Design a binder for this molecule. Structure first.
Ligand SMILES: [Cl-]
Lengths: 252, 251
């Protein structure tokens, strides 16, 4: 495994390359998490080792969200959702990549989608989780946005290992985002839309599917999830990823 | 004057820093470069005062600068959107914070897309013959901005690369609609300039209908049938004077 900081258009982004003619899997997490909180559980599951063995994986920590990140200056003009997507091309450029298979959650899904829409030749397909195309302690907000031994473990990592000021900026940015202007101008690659039943973001994920092409977009509403697919049922999701990548011309 | 190549997100862009608080960033139209498109304005006499007080940065789109090597065959030329993602890197190279943009046809579209993505880096935009929607080389160019000219026709042939120009033009025509509606719209003052009896009067007005009028002003030049900077640069040099004043700078 190797980690690095990539100087991009709008500051640095921490990345974690970890894996083996095949696109690279680029992940972008949600607000309130980093790549360890959001994907390390998923990508260490057994039904994913095969992907990990056949594919290269690149985990992107949004600006200031990596473990033990220094606070940005006061008044920092934090990159908007659009500005966060313009940073992705530089990632590929740093490793001589040509295309990636993106996987995003909450804010990551929005960013990756905006990045596919700007540079569609660099994206083979997107896995979008809980995407939304539109006086509380921070650990309370985070838990209340995406929702047990899990809840406390996430509140516990948010506090000790992450920076409160940086997280505020990132969250304040995602909420001032604009609508993806998409019409069934739309995605030019296959999409995998994943949400759980009785989950906070079902209507939002369904609204995004209504504006996408059904020929190459598939919806998957897991029954016993109601929150984050990689938390509730990562196993069922690890196979969902298998079937999506296969259809494009790649081997799990 | 000093010129440089700026390595950006999507390859290099040639720039020409030349001047002396915001910086004036210029972007040309299809069929031109900064010499064909802005040198008339910025060497005009009624503009010297601006030239004296401001720093100017002229951007030549990839492959449009004088004597540019041909891109490889099959080159995926940056789209209009990808051409806007390149501008932040320009400011980043010279420690800039905001600029006053001036664009023409394709330049106006690019800068507008750049202001919409990074509105804190633009104090105001001068958009000329902007369109927010979608044969020998010199003839193609002339029919886009007119409906003596020979000075432009000869420069297309002798001084610039024909293949690069094709790619640039092929991109401008595959552009999409700007996500703008008068109340998601521009968050800075805009100066929309088009001539009377000009190919892009209806299009330039369509852009103003989607902009905020409190800070947007439209300008229909009376006897301008092509490029405002060619026909009546004086009328435009005074329009530019007043635009910068209203923002808090003393041209
Ligand atoms: Cl007006």
């Amino acid at each position: 495994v190797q980690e690095q900081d990539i100087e991009t258009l709008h500051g640095s982004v921490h990345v974690t390359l970890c894996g083996t003619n095949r696109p690279v899997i680029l992940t972008y997490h949600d607000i309130g998490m980093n790549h360890k909180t959001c994907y390390n559980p998923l990508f260490n599951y057994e039904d994913m080792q095969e992907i990990t063995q056949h594919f290269a994986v690149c985990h992107v920590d949004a600006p200031g969200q990596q473990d033990g990140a220094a606070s940005f200056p006061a008044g920092y003009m934090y990159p908007s959702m659009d500005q966060l997507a313009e940073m992705l091309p530089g990632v590929l450029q740093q490793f001589g990549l040509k295309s990636i298979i993106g996987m995003g959650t909450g804010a990551g899904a929005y960013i990756l989608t905006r990045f596919a829409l700007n540079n569609p030749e660099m994206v083979e397909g997107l896995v979008l989780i809980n995407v939304n195309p539109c006086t509380q302690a921070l650990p309370d907000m985070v838990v209340s946005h995406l929702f047990v031994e899990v809840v406390h473990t996430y509140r516990q990592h948010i506090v000790n290992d992450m920076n409160p000021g940086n997280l505020h900026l990132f969250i304040n940015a995602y909420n001032s985002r604009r609508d993806l202007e998409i019409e069934r101008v739309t995605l030019q690659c296959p999409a995998l839309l994943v949400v759980g039943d009785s989950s906070p973001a079902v209507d939002a994920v369904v609204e995004c599917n209504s504006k996408l092409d059904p020929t190459k977009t598939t919806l998957l509403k897991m029954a016993d999830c109601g929150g984050l697919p990689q938390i509730s049922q990562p196993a069922k999701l690890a196979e969902a990823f298998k079937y999506f990548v296969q259809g494009m011309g790649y081997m799990p």
